[PDB]
Design a protein around this nucleic acid. Structure first.
Ligand SMILES: [Mg+2]
Ligand SMILES: [Mg+2]
Ligand SMILES: [Mg+2]
Ligand SMILES: [Mg+2]
Ligand SMILES: [Mg+2]
Ligand SMILES: [Mg+2]
Ligand SMILES: [Mg+2]
Lengths: 315, 79, 195, 85, 101, 132, 517, 88, 49
RNA sequence: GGACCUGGCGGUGCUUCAUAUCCCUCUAGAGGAGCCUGUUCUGUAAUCGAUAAACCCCGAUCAACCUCACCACCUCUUGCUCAGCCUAUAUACCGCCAUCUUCAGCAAACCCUGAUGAAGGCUACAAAGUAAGCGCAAGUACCCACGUAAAGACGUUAGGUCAAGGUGUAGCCCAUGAGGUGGCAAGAAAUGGGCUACAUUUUCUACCCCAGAAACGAUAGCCCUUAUGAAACUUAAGGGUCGAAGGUGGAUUUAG
């Protein structure tokens, strides 16, 4: 089955040559990302699952790894702990307890001679390819924690850094809108917003009296209901700029509370440009600078609607 | 999509102006109003050929002069 | 009884041009391709299926026939039927000053040898009204006469015609309707004083 | 009403009933049994029920370097192949 | 070989309705008029009730072309909900997929 | 218990192809449509005719060629194209196959009044994807 | 016209033959099942009506009419029904669609009915006499052609080229050493056309040309003169008269191919341009031109027929299968044994691979040309192509290819020669054999493979023939220098046991291998 | 070829209808079938009749088997005849 | 016109060009049904025998 | 008859949970009145099958005439399609599915233990279980990762559908096959589900909710007109007459 791997790698190579030929490029420059672009355009599959695609890659991702033979012709195992079956995991455990034992030896003989994250079990059986369970993995992790606590040298720092990974960003800080200048446009910014099938684009104007215009016409004439008026006063009550903004706005789709919440979100995203950053940090953890995901869900058949069952009699 | 299916080369005015098929009919009254209605009905029908429209026209003429008993009982003269 | 023939995959060399190989839109016989691409939802300890027996490659069309250099070859052989959009007629205001009347057409396609389409016979006529010699009572009469067929905002009279199944026939009909409307716009009738 | 004529294994799954409810509780005497035999072993392509001769299906094409003609056998040759079946 | 008579009689009604189209068209043109007074409409009624049966498209029953079922039919593809589901679950009719929403 | 035209694995003893091993809740996900035509898009006329043509075509092409289809047909469809590409067993003579390809060309092209070119992709056996 | 897929491709021209006849016989029984039920393909769903979609009709719809019934029973046993309804319904036969139509239908009885209509119905006997002389060429009648030309001259009309051309052709058929009779016939026809005031035809030119060129071995001169007489009309000569010209130039032009070049130049004026087709044989002239240029090594006419083959006008390819086979074989043998290795590789890509596989002498020319350029690596694929093509010449092709691998020694880079020897060995013993067995033994001896040499010896030693004496001494050396005298003992005992003359020297080699080794 | 088009996508339509799952009686369980219809237009500007036949041919000789086509030309004309200064 | 389809397949089976497995199976079961001893009555035999 | 194994069961023990859930809790409804649509039954010459969870605006996204498988009467026997059947068997089946299932198991091949018995194979500081495949999970569409949809293995009820369609078993086939008019669908009596209401947060005129006035709801039945149909006896819409009883429903529950 290794000979099949050789044939597949040379077929991938000569197909790379013929893709460079039909695409008119050099076989020395026609690379993997361009290979993906070309084959992705050349065979338009209409499927949603990306594993059901026309795939031509590095064939060692396409083929599973055929395992190394542990014995020669004389039949002796090459690895010392082969006869436990789990040779690689137990070998690694033996080496790690050796590193911990010589580290304890170094601490006793030091008194005598004086962001990142762990792997998962799936990532470990990706690395050391050999199947495990969960309690042995957890025991290995707890051994690593007892490694990481002692006065461990930089070689042992690299050695534990083999099984460390890199976490994502916990970077969710809000986004400032830039102050824009459109034909003597001072104290101006914009944003957008959306809640409950409703799009709204509000403008902030820091030079005006305390009222709101919407599509030119006044927000008292736009809102006869006091709940919506509290909804619009909410951010401006939070930044104490009740009289500093005569503002024009736009909204489209939906009813009273929908357009009110959408305009509130647009004003909240817009007002970051003329405040301190701690203002919108506090506003964000007051709950302002986010989309409310509550869109009403579809009805499911066989029911009254979307949650309620029919009056199923028991008898 | 008009290839071969061509309504036999008729002009637009052979569809619109159908006054050329309405000879033996009166001028001002109820039945000429009925004939204007069926003429303007066949005017706005593009699912029929002009030959078929004149075929329905002659059927109306043949029928309306066929039963002249009640049409002369109708206290108004049909031509 | 039984025979054994290898494909042309080993036979065709490296530098054979693809218009000679894949001219036209293929149902993809995998004898001719030298490209080893697999498609399929693969099994867990296995492979996606290769191109042999690949019905998923048969239902999905390849774009191998449209070789971009062969696209270029067919374009440069198609240089001959061309004309030129004349350079006075590029900015669209000047195109309206030279041609302010637009006639639309309709054509579609269908799966199957039957060709007819019922919605392919309307030719909507679109005239911008500010190019005409319409006087004041005349323009007022044309507005009163058409009614709602004329867009008041950007001054575009739009007249639809589907009373007959031919495009040229309805086009001559809309031209006749404009012709008798611009007959009628001048003429002040007897009751127009009784306004 | 005509287009429900189906494949062969579907006919045998319909009439055989060897995935039905009678197998599991031993719901019959086992002496009542109907086996399954093959219907598609012995009809070659271009086996017409009339005596039809083919240079592409029945008989091989180049008769020592010449084509044969489209023909059809007689009646008693059809009787011979019926008695053979 | 056809076996059945409900399906065959619906095809009978379809073809004899296709014949008797323009005559009933002219009679109902005589019917629905506030002009053209009453007795002409009444002899038109005599005529159209005197027409033979299986001659009006009232009788038309849009049954299936694969199993002849009167009910549970799509008029988009002129067959039953069973056989359309049969060939849809096999995967031949294009565009129709099972809805995952 | 929903049972479609899917495979219900009894033992590891049933050779099954790629097509039969996917249930119709995978069609937009992991499969492909056997025929493809614009008759199901809107707007478009002539739909039920396209369906009866496909059903009669597939049942005819199977019941004519005895066991000479490893899988079902592929009826791609483009106007005046009824393009056949099927997968046949490497059992019989190619002389007889060309006889039958011309036979289906003539009969279909004169019955449904349309240019048809056949294509075949021969397979040595039943194509297998799973022992399911 | 065939598929591209690997299982159904042809590998011989017989395979393509049976493929195409399978296609057309399916088409014929398809049109037979269509006309046996004409009421089944009439429901039309396609709009723009491709006209080949309705069946054809052999029925008469008119009976009480006479001329319409005769035309609708003949031109639409059916000829017998038209003739019987014409004889009993007072329906006069015409001078068109009846004489040659019932002559192709049915040919002494057609002449009998035509003569009864000529003595029974007052038609203008000029065109009827022309069609009667043309039918008399195929009903084997000459004095009727003389009476037809006389009745055409006296029938108050000018004669056609059909009657006089049929007379010239069927009279110069059995021309017993006639060398001036054709010139007298051409001159009398020239006076006849000057009395007829119209140009002479291409039909009479080709007919008199073929009938004069088959009369003597070197009588292509008057045939080429008839080709030039057609060429002096305003239209060009046909390629059929030029084909007869090149054919009579190729038989009697044995010591000099200049007259073959002259008739080839007649064809090059006749078909050496865009094909304006009027010839009955527009392929024989170009095929014979390529055969002359390939049998005389003239690289101008081969290029002429090759450029005229399929690029400019592809009428010059093939009427038969034999036309394509002969043209490809001649040009490929000339390009292989005359040109270098690049053109021979082009021949292997573009005539043997463009048509089907090679012939037996074509494979021998390919093997000799490859032995000139030292290419014995793809001998086995062409050998399988020849054995799939030929049922008798596989044994004569495999050994004649493998002699150069059987006589060249073991190089380190010559393993493909031994593999060709092994594949030809299996294919030549396995298909359906003294020289083949001995050649396989000598080839595997020249291979350099120990098990293969021993297996060829153990196979050939029971083929009722021992090896040759050079092979015997090489085997004795490979035994005695193996410290094992068994094969030397076998060679000596078998060349004494197969009644071969290598007895004393071979037994001395065996005793030297046993005792002196 | 110098045709100067843009690319633009109209919003989708999803036809969703519903059938009975069982055959005799289980009403509360149904089987929905989707029907997704996508939309992809082009605006072809400033070409003559012959050139429109060129590019329309180069589409409709390469038209796939799953997509549709709707052709709507906006043709030109200067003036009707009896419209200059007419009395009928 | 479905009757054309039915009679078309009927002749193609009768000419042996189509292999109609459903009718082969139906004549097999009819063959067994006449082979047992319970076949169709004749025109004129029935309840009145 | 003595002993034992597996499963079921216990108004069987201990412990821990149930997130629309078992209760105490929270909201809105049914059962009380009118009508519509299904079930049993009566009359008639008058359909077929489901009828406990898992059946009831069922099969039906359509029984005034075809839809008529129900019958009376008048007829036909290549009868009509090389026959056909809607004749009895879902207790011969294919095919489609309902509940368990809003799960986590099912499981080919070995090995071991029970003195080599049916059977069992669980202790991570690990005393014999390993393991290919299905499923869950992983994955796909909708607004993403949430959630919804979709899938949901093997078995359970001889579960339902031989009147989606074919089919074995038995029966008719000068009929149980087939062509025509008529009526079968109206209520003795209960009965599941749905709509309307039973008021003052209510009703009406305009306004889409800065007003004013009045301190409710309509079936059926009656007369007329309109829509389609060859035909209004019920189907759909509009005008008018009176408009019944309901004055917020109890054991019992339904859904979130
Ligand atoms: Mg609700
Ligand atoms: Mg389910
Ligand atoms: Mg019955
Ligand atoms: Mg049952
Ligand atoms: Mg899952
Ligand atoms: Mg599910
Ligand atoms: Mg039941």
């Amino acid at each position: 089955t290794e000979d099949f791997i050789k044939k597949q790698i040379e077929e991938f190579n000569i197909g790379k040559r013929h893709l460079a030929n039909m695409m008119g490029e050099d076989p020395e420059t026609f690379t993997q990302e361009d290979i993906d672009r070309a084959i992705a355009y050349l065979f338009p599959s209409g499927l949603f699952e990306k594993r059901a695609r026309p795939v031509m890659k590095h064939p060692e991702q396409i083929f599973p790894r055929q395992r190394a033979i542990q014995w020669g012709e004389d039949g002796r195992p090459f690895h010392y702990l082969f006869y436990t079956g789990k040779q690689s995991y137990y070998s690694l455990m033996h080496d790690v307890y050796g590193m911990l034992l010589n580290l304890e030896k170094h601490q006793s003989h030091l008194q005598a001679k004086s962001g990142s994250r762990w792997l998962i079990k799936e990532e470990l059986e990706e690395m050391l390819v050999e199947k495990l369970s969960d309690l042995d993995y957890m025991q290995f992790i707890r051994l690593l924690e007892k490694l990481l606590t002692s006065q461990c040298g930089a070689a042992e720092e690299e050695f534990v850094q083999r099984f460390r990974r890199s976490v994502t960003l916990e970077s969710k800080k809000q986004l400032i809108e830039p102050v824009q200048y459109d034909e003597q446009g001072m104290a101006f910014s914009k944003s957008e917003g959306k809640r409950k099938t409703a799009k709204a684009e509000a403008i902030v104007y820091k030079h005006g009296s305390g009222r709101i215009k919407v599509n030119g016409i006044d927000y008292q004439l736009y809102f006869p209901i006091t709940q919506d008026r509290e909804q619009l006063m909410f951010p401006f009550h939070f930044v104490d700029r009740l009289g500093k903004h005569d503002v024009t706005c736009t909204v489209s789709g939906g009813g009273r509370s929908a357009q009110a919440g959408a305009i509130r979100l647009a004003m909240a995203k817009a007002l970051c440009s003329f405040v301190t950053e701690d203002e919108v940090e506090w506003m964000r953890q007051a709950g302002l600078l986010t989309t409310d995901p509550r869109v009403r869900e579809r009805k499911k058949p066989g029911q009254e609607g979307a949650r309620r069952k029919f009056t199923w009699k028991k008898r | 999509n008009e290839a071969g299916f061509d309504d036999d080369g008729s002009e637009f005015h052979e569809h619109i102006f159908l006054e050329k098929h309405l000879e033996s009919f009166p001028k001002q009254g109820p039945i000429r109003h009925f004939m204007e209605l069926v003429t303007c009905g066949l005017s706005k029908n593009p699912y029929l050929s002009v030959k078929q429209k004149v075929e329905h026209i002659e059927w109306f003429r043949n029928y309306f002069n066929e039963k002249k008993d009640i049409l002369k009982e109708s206290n108004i003269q049909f031509n | 009884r039984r025979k054994a023939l290898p494909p042309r995959t080993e036979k065709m060399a490296v530098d054979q041009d693809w218009p000679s190989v894949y001219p036209v839109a293929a149902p993809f016989k995998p004898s001719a391709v030298p490209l080893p691409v697999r498609m399929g939802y693969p099994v867990k300890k296995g492979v996606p299926m290769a191109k042999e027996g690949n019905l998923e490659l048969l239902k999905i069309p390849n774009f191998l026939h449209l070789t971009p250099v062969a696209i270029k070859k067919h374009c440069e052989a198609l240089k001959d039927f061309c004309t030129e959009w004349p350079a006075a007629l590029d900015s669209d205001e000047k195109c309206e000053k030279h041609f302010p009347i637009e006639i639309d057409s309709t054509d579609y396609v269908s799966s199957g040898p039957s060709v007819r389409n019922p919605r392919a016979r309307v030719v909507v006529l679109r005239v911008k009204l500010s190019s005409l010699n319409l006087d004041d009572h005349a323009k007022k009469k044309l507005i009163k006469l058409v009614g709602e067929r004329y867009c008041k905002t950007t001054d575009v009279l739009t007249i639809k015609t589907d009373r007959c199944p031919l495009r040229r026939q309805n086009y001559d009909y809309a031209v006749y309707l404009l012709t008798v409307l611009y007959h009628e716009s001048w003429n002040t009738e007897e009751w127009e004083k009784s306004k | 009403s005509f287009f429900t004529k189906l494949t062969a294994d579907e006919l045998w799954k319909g009439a055989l009933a060897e995935t039905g409810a009678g197998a599991k509780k031993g719901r019959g005497k086992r002496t009542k049994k109907k086996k399954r035999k093959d219907l598609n072993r012995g009809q070659i392509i271009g086996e017409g029920r009339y005596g039809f001769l083919w240079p592409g299906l029945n008989v091989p094409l180049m008769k020592n370097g010449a084509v044969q003609t489209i023909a059809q056998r007689s009646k008693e040759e059809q009787e011979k192949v019926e008695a053979d079946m | 070989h056809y076996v059945d008579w409900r399906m065959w009689r619906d095809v009978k009604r379809r073809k004899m309705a296709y014949e008797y189209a323009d005559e009933r068209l002219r009679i109902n043109s005589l019917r629905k008029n506030t002009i053209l007074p009453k007795i002409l409409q009444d002899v038109a009624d005599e005529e159209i009730a005197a027409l033979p049966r299986d001659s009006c498209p009232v009788r038309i029953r849009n049954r299936c072309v694969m199993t002849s079922r009167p009910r549970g039919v799509k008029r988009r593809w002129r067959l039953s909900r069973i056989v359309f589901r049969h060939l849809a679950d096999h995967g031949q009719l294009s565009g129709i997929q099972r809805a995952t929403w | 218990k929903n049972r479609a035209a899917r495979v219900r694995v009894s033992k590891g003893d049933k050779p099954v192809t790629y097509e039969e091993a996917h249930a119709p809740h995978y069609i937009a996900h992991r499969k492909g449509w056997l025929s493809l035509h614009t008759g199901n898009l809107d707007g478009e006329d002539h739909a039920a005719e396209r369906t009866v043509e496909d059903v009669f075509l597939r049942k005819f092409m199977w019941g004519t060629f005895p066991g000479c289809l490893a899988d079902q047909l592929v009826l791609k469809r483009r106007g005046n194209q009824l393009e056949i590409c099927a997968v046949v067993l490497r059992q019989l003579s190619p002389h007889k196959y060309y006889f039958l390809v011309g036979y289906s060309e003539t009969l279909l092209s004169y019955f449904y009044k349309c240019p048809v070119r056949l294509h075949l992709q021969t397979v040595p056996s039943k194509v297998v994807y799973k022992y399911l | 016209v065939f598929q591209d897929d690997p299982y159904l491709m042809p590998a011989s021209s017989l395979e393509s033959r049976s493929f195409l006849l399978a296609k057309k016989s399916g088409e014929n029984v398809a049109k037979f099942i269509i006309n046996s039920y004409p009421k089944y393909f009439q429901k039309d769903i396609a709009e723009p009506h491709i006209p080949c979609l309705m069946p054809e009709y052999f029925e008469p719809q008119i009976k009480d009419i006479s001329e319409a019934a005769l035309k609708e029973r003949i031109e639409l046993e059916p000829s017998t029904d038209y003739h019987f309804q014409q004889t009993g319904q007072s329906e006069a036969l015409e001078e068109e669609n009846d004489e040659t139509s019932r002559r192709k239908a049915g040919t002494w009885r057609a002449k009998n009915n035509a003569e009864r209509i000529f003595s029974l119905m007052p038609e203008k006997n000029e065109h009827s006499y022309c069609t009667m002389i043309r039918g008399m060429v195929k009903h084997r009648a000459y004095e009727q052609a003389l009476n037809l030309y006389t009745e055409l001259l006296n029938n108050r009309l000018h004669a056609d080229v059909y009657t006089f051309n049929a007379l010239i052709e069927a009279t110069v058929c059995a021309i017993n050493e006639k060398f001036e009779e054709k010139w007298s016939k051409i001159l009398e026809l020239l006076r006849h056309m000057v009395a007829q005031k119209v140009k002479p035809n291409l039909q009479t030119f080709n007919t008199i040309l073929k009938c004069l060129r088959r009369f003597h071995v070197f009588a292509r001169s008057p045939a080429l003169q008839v080709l030039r007489e057609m060429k002096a009309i305003g239209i060009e000569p046909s390629l059929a008269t030029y084909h007869h010209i090149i054919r009579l130039f190729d038989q009697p032009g044995d010591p000099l191919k200049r007259s073959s070049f002259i008739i080839y130049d007649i064809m090059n004026e006749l078909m050496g341009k865009r094909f304006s087709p009027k010839d009955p044989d527009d392929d024989k002239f170009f095929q014979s031109a390529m055969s002359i240029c390939s049998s005389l090594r003239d690289l101008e006419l081969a290029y002429q027929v090759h450029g005229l083959l399929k690029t400019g006008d592809n009428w010059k390819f093939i009427g038969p299968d034999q036309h394509r086979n002969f043209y490809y074989s001649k040009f490929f043998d000339l390009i292989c044994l005359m040109e270098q290795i690049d053109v021979t590789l082009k021949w292997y890509e573009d005539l043997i691979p463009s048509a089907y596989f090679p012939h037996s002498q074509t494979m021998i020319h390919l093997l000799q040309a490859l032995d000139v350029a030292n290419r014995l690596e793809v001998i086995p694929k062409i050998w399988k192509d020849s054995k799939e093509y030929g049922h008798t010449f596989r044994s004569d092709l495999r050994e004649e290819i493998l002699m150069l691998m059987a006589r060249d020694k073991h190089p380190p880079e010559l393993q493909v020669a031994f593999a060709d020897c092994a594949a030809d060995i299996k294919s030549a013993y396995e298909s359906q054999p003294a020289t083949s067995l001995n050649c396989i033994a000598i080839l595997f001896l020249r291979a350099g493979r120990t098990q293969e040499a021993w297996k060829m010896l153990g196979l050939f030693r029971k083929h009722n023939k021992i090896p040759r004496s050079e092979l015997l001494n090489e085997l004795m050396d490979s035994a005695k220098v193996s410290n094992s005298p068994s094969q030397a003992i076998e060679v000596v005992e078998l060349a004494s046991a197969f009644s071969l003359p290598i007895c004393e020297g071979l037994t001395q080699r065996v005793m030297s291998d046993f005792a002196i080794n | 070829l110098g045709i100067s088009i843009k690319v633009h996508e109209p919003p989708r339509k999803i036809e969703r209808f519903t059938l009975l799952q069982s055959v005799h009686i289980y009403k509360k369980h149904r089987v929905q079938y989707e029907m997704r219809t996508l939309y992809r237009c082009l605006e072809l500007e400033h070409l003559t009749g012959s050139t429109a036949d060129v590019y329309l041919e180069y589409i409709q000789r390469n038209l796939p088997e799953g997509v549709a086509m709707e052709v709507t030309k906006t043709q030109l004309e200067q003036l009707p005849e009896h419209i200059k200064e007419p009395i009928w | 016109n479905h009757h054309t389809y039915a009679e078309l397949m009927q002749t193609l089976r009768f000419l042996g060009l189509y292999r109609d497995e459903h009718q082969d199976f139906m004549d097999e079961q009819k063959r067994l049904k006449k082979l047992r001893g319970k076949e169709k009555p004749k025109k004129g035999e029935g309840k009145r025998a």
